[PDB]
Amino acid sequence: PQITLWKRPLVTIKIGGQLKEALLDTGADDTVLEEMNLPGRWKPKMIGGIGGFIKVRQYDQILIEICGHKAIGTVLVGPTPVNIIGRNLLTQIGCTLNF
Amino acid sequence: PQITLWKRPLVTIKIGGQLKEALLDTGADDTVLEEMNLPGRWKPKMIGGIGGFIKVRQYDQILIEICGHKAIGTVLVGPTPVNIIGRNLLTQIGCTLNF
Numbered sequence: 066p067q068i069t070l071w072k073r074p075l076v077t078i079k080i081g082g083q084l085k086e087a088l089l090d091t092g093a094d095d096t097v098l099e100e101m102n103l104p105g106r107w108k109p110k111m112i113g114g115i116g117g118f119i120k121v122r123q124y125d126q127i128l129i130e131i132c133g134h135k136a137i138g139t140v141l142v143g144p145t146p147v148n149i150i151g152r153n154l155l156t157q158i159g160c161t162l163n164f
Numbered sequence: 165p166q167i168t169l170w171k172r173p174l175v176t177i178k179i180g181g182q183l184k185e186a187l188l189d190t191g192a193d194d195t196v197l198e199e200m201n202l203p204g205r206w207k208p209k210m211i212g213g214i215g216g217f218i219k220v221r222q223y224d225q226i227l228i229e230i231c232g233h234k235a236i237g238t239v240l241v242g243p244t245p246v247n248i249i250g251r252n253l254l255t256q257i258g259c260t261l262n263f
């Protein structure tokens with residue numbers, strides 16, 4: 066699929082047996098998901114964005130199927146206003162920008 | 165250009181006679197540039213992000229040359245940590261996501 070940017074680049078993702086909508090975000094280095102029950106242990110981490118910082122739970126080697134394409138990587142869970150798929154996962158499914 | 169996402173997709177911009185680097189950000193609805201001296205009027209605005217909100221100056225009908233491509237739209241100026249080109253202008257340069 067080729068995606069235009071006239072609307073929010075939202076895809077349906079499946080993570081931890083749950084279905085969600087996430088924003089394909091080329092400006093995000095890592096993936097940050099709203100509060101959700103992720104399996105396993107975690108590590109506290111702090112990440113910064115517009116308006117300040119948030120505390121997140123870092124889960125490593127998490128499976129995540131973005132638009133039918135499978136990827137495993139680090140997922141951060143915390144008080145983000147939107148689920149964002151970052152470059153750590155976009156690279157694994159071959160997503161590219163074109164203009 | 166087709167851009168891979170193994171590194172941040174940072175591109176050159178020309179705005180107000182000034183040269184800057186900006187991030188092609190599909191997760192941003194609007195364009196937000198780091199603090200810079202822009203000519204003309206503006207209106208007070210507040211914008212939200214991962215960590216919260218910041219107050220910015222909204223400028224309309226501002227010309228920007230993103231990696232040699234010309235576009236006119238709304239530019240927000242404020243305490244953002246990075247210059248980010250949002251979808252309001254990405255559509256103007258024909259930017260698409262591809263996977």
Ligand SMILES: CC[C@H](C)CN(C[C@@H](O)[C@H](Cc1cc(F)cc(F)c1)NC(=O)O[C@H]1CO[C@H]2OCC[C@H]21)S(=O)(=O)c1ccc([C@@H](C)O)cc1
Nearest residue numbers: 092093094095112113114115147191192193194213214246
């Ligand atoms: C410093 C570089 C930029 C700002 C990083 N960010 C990516 C951006 O794309 C971000 C995505 C976004 C979309 C939302 F709908 C809600 C939201 F809270 C965040 N957009 C954003 O703030 O845009 C502004 C302007 O347009 C408006 O629309 C959306 C909100 C407004 S991040 O998310 O802060 C971030 C990502 C990863 C990491 C670590 C884990 O690697 C840390 C921080």
